[PDB]
Design a protein around this ligand. Structure first.
Ligand SMILES: COc1cc(-c2cncc(-c3ccc(C4CCN(C)CC4)cc3)c2C)cc(OC)c1OC
Ligand SMILES: COc1cc(-c2cncc(-c3ccc(C4CCN(C)CC4)cc3)c2C)cc(OC)c1OC
Ligand SMILES: COc1cc(-c2cncc(-c3ccc(C4CCN(C)CC4)cc3)c2C)cc(OC)c1OC
Length: 283
């Protein structure tokens, strides 16, 4: 039998220090091909090791197809092949789109569903997993208006995180590195920021905020570790909740939710499962 391995690379949809992402074609079917830089080879090994341990299958987790290592004359070529989501990242989608109540709730509940799936241990099953790099660039928008979580290169089972999204205990190095729940608490912090990014784009009474990244008003682009620690740990600043949210019952309930993700004390933060329940009772 013929094992068809040819993937036509059609267009580069991402370039960075990590390497590149391509829209590709396999047997007439779009796939996403992440080609890792030598700089980020450990992310390919960690994602491959995780999927060799547990084949994650969830509508809100980016769909795994293949890990490929190919021998080159002077080098090793590393590809991760996944489902392709043509609408792109939540980050990209929020730039150019506003949301209504239904589409705002559908987005954040689908992210919470993917995150609770990562976090939960199932006996028989899956280990508990923490993402450790949750952000709007690591979330893809599907045509049915739900999202899926991408990039398990930093994932831990039971490189550092994007500094803009680091929880206080990571910035001040008090995180209990031996406690698995510590890593879930770090993801909940970052989930609260993503919730804030999305909520800003939900229209109420004819008003919407411009897309902005978390802490846009208090740190530079490519903020330093020190920049983030002063804002988050020393001054204990949190993203602004605009007054206009308090005229809307959905945005009021989401403000409360994001506040309960942002406690300085990691152990006070909501679990992914509690966030899910709260979101199902909203509207
Ligand atoms: C090596 O590499 C790649 C391979 C493939 C690929 C292509 N055709 C068929 C297959 C296939 C799947 C499953 C079986 C089963 C049959 C039943 N038996 C009891 C166990 C084995 C056989 C064959 C694969 C895995 C695609 C790839 O990319 C999309 C590959 O990576 C480049
Ligand atoms: C990696 O990805 C894709 C792979 C394939 C593909 C190609 N040949 C054969 C297979 C296959 C057949 C049979 C078994 C099982 C079924 C019975 N069991 C008891 C033992 C053996 C497993 C696998 C597949 C899945 C198609 C895809 O989509 C069209 C893939 O996605 C891009
Ligand atoms: C976060 O990380 C990973 C993401 C992906 C991935 C999967 N589907 C689609 C995309 C994508 C497609 C298209 C656009 C743009 C380009 C055209 N136009 C301007 C609007 C849309 C953006 C993004 C990506 C980037 C794959 C990965 O692995 C193979 C990733 O890493 C784990």
């Amino acid at each position: 039998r013929t094992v068809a391995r040819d993937i036509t690379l059609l267009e580069c949809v991402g370039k960075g220090r990590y390497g590149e992402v391509w829209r590709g074609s396999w047997q007439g079917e779009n796939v996403a091909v992440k080609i890792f830089s030598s700089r980020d080879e450990k992310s390919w090994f960690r994602e491959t090791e995780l999927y060799n341990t547990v084949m994650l299958r969830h509508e809100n987790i980016l769909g795994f197809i293949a890990s490929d290592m190919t021998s080159r004359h002077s080098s090793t070529q590393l590809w991760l092949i996944t489902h392709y989501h043509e609408m792109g990242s939540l980050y990209d989608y929020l730039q150019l789109t506003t949301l209504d109540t239904v589409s705002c709730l559908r987005i954040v509940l689908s992210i919470a569903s993917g995150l609770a799936h990562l976090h939960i241990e199932i006996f028989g099953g899956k280990p508990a997993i923490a993402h450790r790099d949750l952000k709007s660039k690591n979330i893809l928008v599907k045509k049915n208006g739900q999202c899926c979580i991408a990039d398990l290169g930093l994932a831990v089972m039971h490189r550092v995180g994007t500094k803009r999204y680091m929880a206080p205990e990571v910035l001040d190095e008090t995180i209990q590195v031996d406690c698995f729940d510590s890593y879930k608490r770090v993801d909940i912090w970052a989930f609260g920021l993503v919730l804030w990014e999305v909520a800003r784009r939900m229209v109420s009474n004819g008003i919407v905020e411009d897309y902005k990244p978390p802490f846009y008003d208090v740190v530079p682009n490519d903020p330093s570790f020190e920049d983030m620690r002063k804002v988050v740990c020393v001054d204990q600043q949190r993203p602004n909740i605009p007054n206009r949210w308090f005229s809307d019952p959905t945005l009021t309930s989401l403000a409360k939710l994001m506040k309960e993700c942002w406690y300085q004390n990691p152990s006070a933060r909501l679990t992914a499962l509690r966030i899910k329940k709260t979101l199902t009772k909203i509207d």
